[model samples]
Target chain A: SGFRKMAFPSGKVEGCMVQVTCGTTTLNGLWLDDVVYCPRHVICTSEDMLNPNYEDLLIRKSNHNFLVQAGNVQLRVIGHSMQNCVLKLKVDTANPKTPKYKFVRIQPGQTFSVLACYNGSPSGVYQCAMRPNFTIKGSFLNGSCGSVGFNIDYDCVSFCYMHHMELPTGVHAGTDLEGNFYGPFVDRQTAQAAGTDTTITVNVLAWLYAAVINGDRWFLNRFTTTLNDFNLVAMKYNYEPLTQDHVDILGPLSAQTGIAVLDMCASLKELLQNGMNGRTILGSALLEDEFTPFDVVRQCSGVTF
Target chain B: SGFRKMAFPSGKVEGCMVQVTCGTTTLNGLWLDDVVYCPRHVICTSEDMLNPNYEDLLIRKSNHNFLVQAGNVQLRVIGHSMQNCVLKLKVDTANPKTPKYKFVRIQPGQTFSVLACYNGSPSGVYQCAMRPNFTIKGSFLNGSCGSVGFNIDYDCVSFCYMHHMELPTGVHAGTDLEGNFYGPFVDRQTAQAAGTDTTITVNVLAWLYAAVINGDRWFLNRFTTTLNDFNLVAMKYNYEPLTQDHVDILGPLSAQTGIAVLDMCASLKELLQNGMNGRTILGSALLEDEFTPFDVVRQC
Candidate 1:
């Protein structure tokens, strides 16, 4: 390989400036030597300081068994500490070579789960652990890293869904066929209980807008699907009509989701328009909060949502 | 169905500025009413004026036929006039229903080609023509209007490769299995004839950089693949060693292409460095050529 392994003239320290050159061209950024865990050959200071540690990332269950029922496998991990932790999961064994790696980042107290369908209806061992050095070592997972695994059986689906389930719902919401305790559901009753307040709706709208701007296809789809289901449940329960503000924030989500789902909800158009407005406010807030240059870089690098 | 058809209050003149809003979210950019022929409901003045006319955007052949040999359907359209023309291709028929549309822009004198593969061994009548009123009327194509249609038979490979081949190769360089005439090759003889001049290398490098910055994955892949093939041909003929300047201009191209190809090209490191230098120069030139505000918008 003609790629050069740039040396850090200064000791590898956090926020230490460094430049990488391929021939005469140089890219200037911050250097994070081995001290800061990163998945790339060199960690640029330009990256958000996740500062993930193996100790801080703990699997929810120890030495667990995955029951191969209805052709699916699942596992959950929680970020136990205040600091954000990016955990990598390797299915089957700890073998790095033949591992199915999944990368996920969990905010403090955040619980992340992986659901995978198996192909052979076979029972197998799976392990979820932090990548020892914090460097995302494989290409099969997201290129930049964060969280990365899952299980399956014969006659099954072969996909993995990573869920960041640190919502207002208390931990023990409900269990699925696999006896997996899923995240809480904000149903019609829940909405009515919360009243016509705009604070929760505004924050949720901001979060959804961030996902839309970030081009996070997975998150947006899941959020919309859940929201749609919640609305249906609300209708079933004869809950009060959702406020205009609530529906207004769904504009960008519907737009990003495309025309197919646009017709699914009655007030989706209004919500989408409101969501775009929410996006504008959030964008302004971000501009005010961060340094302009850093903010620009964050947006360009797809870091800002 | 609730989508509103925005109106331009002023006359439908070319370069007449207009804005679009979906429930109060105003999209940025000036609109061209008619001076710049476009196909959107409210043609925003912000679009680059590519008033491609029907005559200027002629299909390479008349009532073209596509033999679905393998799993692909292909066609070629040339921008015959001096104005850069954007062409749209609608597969299936003039009917927007279930139509797969593909849009491509060709520089004046540039020939754009499409190669699409169908999943199943299926056959059907697919038409390509200019969209009525210009808004890229369907999904399967680029939204910004251009020329559009094509037909297909069963037994096809399903993927599209759009090539912008306007190289120095005299236009009638070669024809393919489908009787498609492709651009000339920069073989060993061609390299030697050109010598170690940077002009060709710089221009080609700039084109490649634009594709990279624009994130045109297909163009970047085709360019690299062709360049690799050309280099191999040059080597076979023992063409005069490509000048240092030649290798230098390939930096950004190699970098954008990533590590795999970087390792493949022997002296790619030098070329990549040179390419970066070229990018820097091009960046400055673009900044100087455009208005500061527009330049900022362009870069952003």
Candidate 2:
């Protein structure tokens, strides 16, 4: 209740600027009576930050309502301060019956990832297979009490090769590797009348693998792995073109193949359309209702089979 | 309770093998009466997998007991299967109060990542800041109801430049980038008598940045970003060498710099030896007791 004076630790050298989070450094001096930032982690740097033997560096809030417990007297890794990181998305812990999704806007260069701190085990990051390119899809298989959303702003992002895909109107379209339409259309007339080219620009980067056969972009993923039945059959033909516009993994090669490739492509189209097309926003196969860990890599890093 | 038949869907093409998990094709017939594996996701591939209108592809299990719900009628992308992924470390849910640690042997080349599923919120993967290169350190900031440990076997892992430095025996060893020892040695005589090079071989990889001056390896991370007070001072001097054995980020530049670099490195050593060194296994600065999200990148 009383305002306690915050002092830098012993072995305090000169020229060290005192930094504090939740609490302010601009007091009559550094004091604990300042207004606290709710749900935010308390970080402070002082001459004492470099002391390996200090015990008060780590702090606990018990609840954000009051400031108590050990505080993180962390080693200051400047610019990327961990103080501002944990200061995001503070939802009430009332744990109400909120079953719907929370809509959050993510910028073009920011990648969003969520982590969980569970009761029984350690905190884990839910590397969802679904990327938030247009929308975040798929939920974590494991749940948690302590959940966090982290966003990374990338700088040197290299794009995947070109993906040329077309989604015809008036149909439940499934997309090609990048974002192309391929869902089934019971009636092409209605599909044309009902559908509009749903072009979206948003906060994620997704890498897809596909081949253009005729006009439709055929996904070449199922054949990328040797364990698949198409290993030697299709693997030998996989010439992943890396040109910015030519990011397609498989291209004209499908034309050289017999009916087998065509059949697989057709099957792939039907599989996506009927299987999980409704769950996806764009025709991009990257969106899924059912997810696997492989989706983690494809979504977070721009790697795809 | 009874035997049911599994045939490819109405649009099923010929020559597709029916793949199933938890149940075998060796059954006298496709049936629910077969032996069911506990705690396993039942995945089965059939001609029906290609049908978009199919709802039975995604399954539900009230518990791992009986096989009565819809099974995952998945589109088979051969080789990598989700079946074996969830098959790892099935700890009982009896709510035991186990506060200690679990000793699982990790081989080099595999990364151990844990995820959590909670009662109040969706499942999350805990990207911990403490890596398992030597051991898993640090705990989650948030708690969960569902927890999972996932390990990825990596192929094209790129290494951070080589970190070179030496650790004098007897100090309460805190390591440099890669790993080097620092910590208070009350007396060099006892320090030398009490210490040994604790080199270990294990399952996990960690990336660290460092520089060498004289013989000691100094961590240059505190200066990596311009947000620090030393940006214009030290960053301009950071010449990151890329030659494999020469992955040292800072090198002899610190020698040219004033006493400031040396003083910072000294303070860095003291902060680590006293603050969280007890929790660190490899004397590594990467191994930390008090963790933040930034540790997530340095760790798992």
Candidate 3:
């Protein structure tokens, strides 16, 4: 089962219990739609989002009467943009006494990136696409935010995609636009002097930076990881395609941006090219760190079109 | 006697009739708040304000459950600023088929100035204040928008106050900020070359301009007319106070910023000073064209 059912004392089904963890913040709460519970002097949905010490805001739902789990929250603002609407929610962090998840719907656009406030403190930014077909695909970066971003796809499938590049374990994270990091990939000023001469590193992986291009409204390539050179070095540079039996046991891992083919190197190159095309920081960081040299990548040269 | 009452054959009195004319445009309709009656296929209050060819927006009221005349519309925005609120209304033009009055509640502050769209076109700006005790006081500037501005005070009673300064009959009107007109007062270019040496006139009545200051949120001195010179220039600048009998027939005139006292000169100076204190284009214009020289005003 995807989640466990939580019930009230009268044996009535309350909601489903789903634990959501993005970066360092983990929210342990029930998965319900636009429900509010206030026990103190303040009314629900009226609490100041900036100041978390007050009572919580009631989650007011504007459309789609179904319940969603830890993946995505699709809702709408109350007015003005009610026709082309999306929403905000207050995630309850299991303490019962302190409810701290506040996702504000402040902008009116087809694409929305909400500030995720955890325990009254701003933690990360949740970037999501409001598809014209009335669905949402989003990812949350970790802290002020995260060097290790977790791109989660909610709704059509319960999927969690990790970032393409890995960090050296001690680098600090930057805000969403700063590629979710400060230490590596050169743009040195974001982080403190980590080392004074670090800014020059930008020219090295300069090709790895994400492109912030405007594309279709339904497609948002934010926080997508690069499937660049996974296990390429382990195959002795002898790139070969996998059989259907291999993915059956390994539980399926293919190019997130490309279709699968008989030639494995072609899929890797296609996924690598997608990172540059859509331009995501996570993709850029991956291409800079993990992808192998072009000389060794020439092995998968023959394949059917 | 203030307004005519409309009634349905169902024998209920509808709203009162009040024809409002500011500058060139006049609205001839019953002064009703928050009521929408749409007969077309479109829903009431759901019309596109930008395009006048459709239905009208329904006047949604958020607070103060009563009716207001042509004075002040004290309402609130639907959600975000509901507690500290104000509102928007669509004025019904007399043509039963076409309604073209849309006042939008687009800002949230202690003071508010709504766009008055008449006949589905933006003609002027209506500025008002929201009081702490929860009352409303405001005025309208005729324009983009007014040359000869008529600042009407809606509701403490149906009062319309004309500006203090008088313009020559053919002078054109400007907007609320350029002190209502572009000619004679300088700051040229706003009006095409009606004459060349015009902008220099700005220096002559330079002291006549209004001051934009910060004060109590409840008090907005916008559009308050100056009782500065009055008939002081007529009495050889001798400045004698008015009797309670004169204001009884002539109606009352005082420094809108100051409480009335019997000293005519002090009242004129107070009204004149209030104009320079709270900056308004109408007040500035009045001070420029009407207020006598300080030597003569000093005599008063």
Candidate 4:
């Protein structure tokens, strides 16, 4: 059983484009014609008026039963804001023998169309995810593409939170209008990308920012290490106080933020017992340079709170 | 030291546009606008019109130096990608008696201009991969309003490298051919502002599949467990090989990708051996979830 696939050139590219080279050797061995480029079409759109019709993207996958057919092959997209945008397509049966391909959320204005269906076997590279959270944000696999393309792959895991204060001028006016109880007013860039099964966007942005600061002790001391982990069970909203060890480690449906219930078993057991084990023991004690005791009480109270 | 500031209404309001209501208290604020709409004005020409000057954006300190003058109170960002998307403008000299205020990164796309600058600053925020051995492939923070505008950020960590089967297409037909190998593709997506950050762009289709005869070893029986922690160090020029004992026990780099001096000497030796004790029991069994034999005979 030897199957292979990879075809890109119709989407659109002008600048800041990636995936340097993929098609893996083929002159007489047959099949290899993939090329994608971008440096500055950036956003304008019109990849054939947003290339739909794979029977209109297999009728939006008619409830994922899997059985798609529309292989004539003629893809092309090159950016200009590719019609509102939201294109995610994938098929990589995780290597059955040279089967590698990709397509997941082709951005331009945050994806808005394209959906093809079929799993008639032989899959190694066919990925699509743009607005996914019915089950862990858009799933893509081309065999974990580690060397270039083959073995279903796609990775994104970015989580930065420092918040030391001062980036809010309005909205109750920075630091809650300063009567002193202004804030755990910390501010630092703040980013979150958690893809590649980042367990439901890192447990829905850590219980939706712990239900948007439930019981605001200045937003729980500016969010106590992202809700002192163990899968936020802290049920009970707005009178705010919950410490039976945070309701035995976050239990009351993490307080409340747009209808709670994303307790994927306490968010996969607090993302494997505390966010990938406290970033793998504080990223292996600063990668073994050593300073542990949780980095001298997290940097001698540099005052995150 | 009661320095105060307030402003808002940069531009663009299609469908429910503009809404600023923050009054229960907390007004040490500032938000000046721009990007009313820009396609490079109409695909820019006339020497790409950067003309830009209000004194080169008030003495542009490389870009947005969070300007200040006589401090009666200042918060301004005239417009036009507000000097690379103004992420912060600060002055919370830590309660020196009502000295609290902030501002933010206003982004939309296309030309609006001005600058006074000061949203909230503790030192501005923009350090990731501060440039070193190289190879940083974007995303420390970009757009969707986190400031440090543009470079794929809303949850992105895309990578690809599948053990060489060699397919440059026609060696370089129309150019634009990046699949030369470097990933069993590491894919990660989570960008939603519903309008930009490259709107879900994931282009790199077809990499193998001829009429038949199978070649890249047919996919190797679909290996899983997350592709057994990616190995293949460097076949041809494809590189996925990360083992210096997983870079001296998970430190060498890839803090989700970015930061290298040897990842700050393995994050300062995991922040000074994190209070050593058999390295805190092998750093909590290599960061807890149980099952630690070091993950079945380490190093693939």
TM-score of chain B of each: 0.18, 0.23, 0.21, 0.20
Residue A78 in model 1: shift from native, Å? 25
Query: Distance from true position, residue A101, model 3, in Å?
Result: 30
> Across residues B240-278, which tens digit of lDDT does each residue of candidate 2 receive?
112222212222333333323334433333433354332
Model 2 residue A262 CA deviation (Å) reads: 13
Better of 3 and 4 by TM-score: 4
Give me the runs in candidate 3 sitting further than 4 Å from their true place: A1-55, A59-305, B1-94, B97-169, B172-258, B263-300
Where does model 4 sit among the CAPRI classes? incorrect
- What is the C-alpha lDDT profile of model 2 across A218-265, one tens digit per residue? 343343221243222322333111122221222223333332333443
Q: Each model's TM-score, in the order given? A: 0.19, 0.21, 0.19, 0.20
Expressed as tens digits, the lDDT of each residue in A82-151 for candidate 1 is 1222122222312111222222232111111221111211111112111111111111111112111222
Q: Model 3 Cα displacement at B223 (Å)?
A: 26
> What residue runs in model 2 are displaced by over 4 Å at the alpha carbon?
A1-65, A68-111, A118-122, A129-146, A153-268, A273-305, B1-102, B105-300
- Model 4 CA deviation exceeding 4 Å by range: A1-245, A248-265, A268-305, B1-72, B75-118, B123-127, B130-232, B235-300
- Cα error, residue A57 of model 2, in Å, equals 31
Question: What DockQ values do the models have?
Answer: 0.02, 0.02, 0.01, 0.01
Best-performing candidate as measured by TM-score: 2
| Residue A142 miss distance in model 4 (angstroms) | 49
**Tens digit of per-residue lDDT, candidate 1, span B1-300:** 000011111111111112222122222111111111112211122321234223422333132221111122221211111122222222221211122222223211121121111121110111111111111111121121111122111212111212121123211121221212223222111231211211122233333343344343322222233345545544543332334454554454556556223232322223332333223222121111111111111121
